[PDB]
Ligand binder design. Structure first.
Ligand SMILES: COc1ncc(C2=CCOCC2)cc1NS(=O)(=O)c1cn(Cc2ccccc2)c(C)n1
Length: 854
């Protein structure tokens, strides 16, 4: 009671909506989800408290492995023991494992402390200093991301020996407290009246209604008659559809569109015909309509929360039978689908050709006929077969479901295709999730953004995907972190606020301690929004140095100092944002005046000096998606042994036009480097030299050659990344360069088209200052070609991922026309020889554009 009230109030604070609002709906579906999902999440919390210390480290601190390790050299390492000021620096090998490194630190300590130790290397874990990152398991040292980062950046790994007891004590501190088929009658409804309708009185009103199974129409759309435009239009008419009640699939949805004709749309609303308990809906239903910007089947099946302002459409769902009618159970379906129906040698080859991607009408009749041959010989062709199935014929669906339920578990790639709205069947969705269960946390984390979007196409609150995502978030603290932030950022959207809000409440019941951690993070973002508003005002009246000192005063207050300090980074929970360095903080000159908040850690040293950018006024969803795609490219390339020294820095929308960006330290823009400022080391005689002179100055003597190599490699990666992804609006200010030579792009507002790019100032670097250096240039051309063909081998993965992101609601990613850019860029409808010929020609075409500068 005393703690139940507090947990509830903290959840309300955290999710940005009171739990009383949930109960105010007096909604069975909402109530049944809450009860069932609190129970499922409490079971998770209990499982966690009975984990072993290593399994608990796998929960709180999942391993950060190098892409090539997933599925020799000398190394200087610094080790200390938790509580001790003293440390040991020793030589290890990249091929050595943490148990060898621990056994070694236990020897040094045993000789310094003069006694043979009882403790064994198996009782310890290696914490990365001042980070929520550990090194454990039987993986050689080079396979860990931290060790790799260190090896490249020339820094010494600083590790701490954590005893199992310390980890177990840590666990306890973080513990939770204690029949349809007989009805041949056509589908009919009554369009009674409209309410709160606003439109031109010169025009007339009409209602268009259509029956959908996803996108595919179940029958012809039906329109009402033309009534006069007013606030309350009264139709009181019948709309009969050319489909029998028996043929209604489980996931059938009635779609409405209210518009004004002489063509202007007013509003849209849809609903499921069967409720969450599989009962066919009857009685009077009020559809609180959403504004239209003519049917929208993809749109949500829940009403517009703004009941006061919104237009309403009152409909009557007629009583079909004297008793309640439920959708048949799987047992009745697999019974009807069991009984069905030889094939010819030539039609067996015609099939092998069209299963190896739209088809003609006669081929559908062939893929349907050979459905058992599809299951047995081409199991990966499920999706094409599912698209030739008539979801308007109840026996054809029964036949399909009989095969799906015997169908083997598909690879992840195929299962991702099945999450598309094009496959709205629930037994199809459950099958897809069943085939995704084999995703590792690293694969899961990679596609997590796309899976949160898929949640928006869901017709009900209680689903296998919510159960899947919830179970995985509670079993891995990093997944839980990012599932929380993807949902939390979309709370300002009334169409997803209910589902996302209820999901986040469930997670919180399963993770009280993590709710407290995320509360600390929201508390910091609250102060930043308030510091940003002050900065936005102050800067329009006073000068930038003055506004900066005023920002520093405002930050120095008790509430600001406590909120902004000692939190886990929402960009990386492994990164602890410790001590805010007030003197180093500032903001950009742009419209939104984004804040640059700088942090330091006494515990983490060099690695604790981090920077975050708080942005308010701009939508950061497309930046995040692009950066995630660049990250995917990098993983894909590293898996094929290619490290193109990419910088896919963190970017996280946190709320309404609000987000954080990861500051890449020790980097500058080409614009600032090119400014060729006097009384600087880099001062060039010719602007073509500025970039190379800046590189020379940050990398003395022997180091310059490696910086030129870091530049070339990262240049090859971004040339391909921006080409494949259609990144435009490229200027010297949104192309950055790191002190180590790595080139990277920022600010991804325009992608998917909205020609390949090459600059002679980059070519000068690649060529080591030499005017003619085709040895070095062509090495770069080959880096592009190898990178491009690795991406094409995975072209389907980019397509399936981008397809799922149509649910996100991005204006530059909403229809098929957008994904055509990727189809063209990855030239997937061609052979590798025909695509590589096209890459070479586009690289040569981008070169002839560059040569105009030279
Ligand atoms: C989407 O917007 C952003 N995306 C990424 C960044 C990052 C900056 C550095 O670390 C990597 C991430 C920053 C922003 N937003 S902004 O308003 O700060 C910004 C700064 N700049 C040029 C600039 C950069 C650095 C130093 C001086 C000036 C531009 C063009 N935008």
């Amino acid at each position: 009671d005393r703690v139940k009230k507090l947990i509830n109030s903290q959840i309300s604070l955290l999710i940005g909506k009171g739990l009383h609002e949930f109960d105010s709906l007096r909604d069975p579906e909402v109530n049944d989800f809450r009860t069932k999902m609190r129970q499922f999440c409490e079971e998770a919390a209990a499982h966690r408290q009975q984990l072993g210390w290593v399994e608990w480290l796998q929960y709180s601190f999942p391993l950060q492995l190098e892409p090539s390790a997933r599925g020799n050299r000398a190394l200087l390492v610094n080790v200390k023991f938790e509580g001790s000021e003293e440390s040991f620096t020793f030589q290890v090998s990249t091929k050595d494992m943490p148990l060898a490194l621990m056994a070694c630190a236990l020897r040094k300590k045993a000789t310094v402390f003069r006694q043979p130790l009882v403790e064994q290397p198996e009782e310890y874990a290696l914490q990365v200093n001042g980070r929520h990152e550990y090194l454990y398991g039987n993986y050689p040292l080079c396979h860990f991301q931290y060790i790799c980062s260190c090896l490249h950046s020339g820094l010494t790994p600083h590790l701490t020996m954590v005893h199992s007891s310390s980890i177990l004590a840590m666990r306890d501190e973080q513990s939770n407290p204690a029949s349809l088929w007989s009805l041949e009658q056509p589908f009919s409804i009554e369009l009674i009246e409209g309410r709160k309708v606003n439109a031109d009185e010169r025009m007339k009103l009409v209602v268009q209604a259509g029956l959908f199974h996803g996108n595919e129409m179940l029958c012809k759309t039906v329109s009402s008659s033309e009534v006069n435009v007013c606030s309350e239009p009264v139709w009181k008419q019948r709309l009969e559809f050319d489909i029998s009640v028996c043929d209604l699939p489980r996931m059938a949805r009635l779609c409405f569109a209210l518009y004004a004709v002489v063509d202007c749309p007013i509003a849209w609303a849809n609903l499921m015909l069967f409720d969450y308990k599989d009962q066919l809906k009857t009685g009077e239903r009020c559809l609180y309509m959403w504004p239209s910007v003519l049917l929208n089947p993809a749109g949500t099946v829940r009403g517009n929360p703004n009941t006061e302002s919104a237009a309403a459409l009152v409909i009557y769902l007629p009583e079909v039978a004297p008793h309640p009618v439920y959708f048949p159970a799987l047992e009745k379906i697999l019974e009807l689908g069991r009984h069905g129906e030889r094939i010819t040698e030539e039609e067996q080859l015609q099939l092998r050709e069209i299963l190896e991607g739209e088809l003609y009408e006669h081929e559908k009749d062939l893929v349907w006929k050979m459905r058992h041959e599809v299951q047995e010989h081409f199991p990966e062709a499920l999706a094409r077969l599912l698209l030739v199935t008539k979801w308007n014929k109840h026996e054809d669906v029964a036949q399909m479901l009989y095969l799906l339920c015997s169908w083997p578990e598909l690879p992840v790639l195929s299962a991702l295709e099945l999450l598309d709205f094009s496959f709205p069947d629930c037994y199809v969705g459950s099958f897809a999730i069943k085939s995704l269960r084999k995703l590792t946390d690293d694969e899961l984390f990679q596609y997590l953004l796309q899976l949160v979007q898929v949640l928006k196409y869901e017709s009900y609150l209680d689903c296998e995907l919510t159960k899947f995502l919830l179970g995985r978030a509670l079993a891995n603290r990093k997944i839980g972190h990012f599932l929380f932030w993807h949902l939390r950022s979309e709370m300002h959207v009334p169409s997803v606020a209910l589902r996302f809000g209820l999901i986040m409440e469930a997670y919180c019941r399963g993770s009280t301690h993590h709710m407290k951690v995320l509360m600390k993070q929201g508390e910091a973002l609250s102060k930043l929004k308030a510091l940003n508003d002050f900065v936005k005002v102050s800067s329009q009246k006073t000068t930038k140095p003055q506004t900066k000192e005023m920002m520093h005063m405002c930050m120095r207050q008790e509430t600001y100092m406590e909120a902004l300090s000692h939190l886990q980074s929402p960009l990386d929970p492994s990164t602890l944002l410790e001590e805010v360095c007030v003197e180093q903080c500032t903001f950009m000159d742009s419209k939104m005046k984004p804040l640059w908040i700088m942090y330091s850690s006494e515990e983490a040293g060099s690695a604790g000096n981090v920077g975050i950018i708080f942005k308010n006024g701009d939508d950061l969803r497309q930046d995040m998606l692009t950066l995630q795609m660049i990250q995917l490219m990098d993983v894909l390339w590293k898996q094929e042994g290619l490290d193109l020294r990419m910088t896919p820095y963190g970017c996280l929308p946190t709320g309404d036009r609000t987000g954080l960006i990861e500051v890449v330290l020790h980097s500058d823009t080409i614009a600032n480097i090119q400014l060729n400022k006097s009384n600087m080391a880099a001062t060039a005689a010719f602007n073509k030299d500025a970039l190379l002179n800046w590189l020379k100055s940050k990398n003395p003597g022997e180091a310059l050659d490696r910086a030129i190599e870091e530049f070339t490699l990262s240049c090859a990666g971004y040339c391909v990344a921006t080409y494949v992804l259609g990144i435009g609006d490229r200027h010297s200010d949104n192309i950055m360069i790191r002190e180590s030579g790595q080139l990277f792009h920022i600010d991804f507002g325009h992608f998917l088209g909205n020609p390949f790019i090459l600059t002679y100032d980059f070519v000068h670097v690649i060529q080591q200052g030499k005017t003619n250096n085709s040895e070095k240039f062509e090495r770069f051309r080959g880096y592009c070609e190898r990178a491009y063909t690795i991406l094409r081998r995975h072209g389907l993965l980019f397509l399936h991922l981008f397809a799922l992101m149509r649910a996100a609601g991005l204006p530059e990613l909403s229809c098929s026309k957008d994904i055509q850019y990727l189809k063209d860029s990855l030239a997937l409808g061609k052979t590798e020889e025909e695509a590589l010929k096209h890459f070479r020609v586009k690289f040569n075409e981008a070169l002839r554009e560059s040569w105009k500068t030279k």
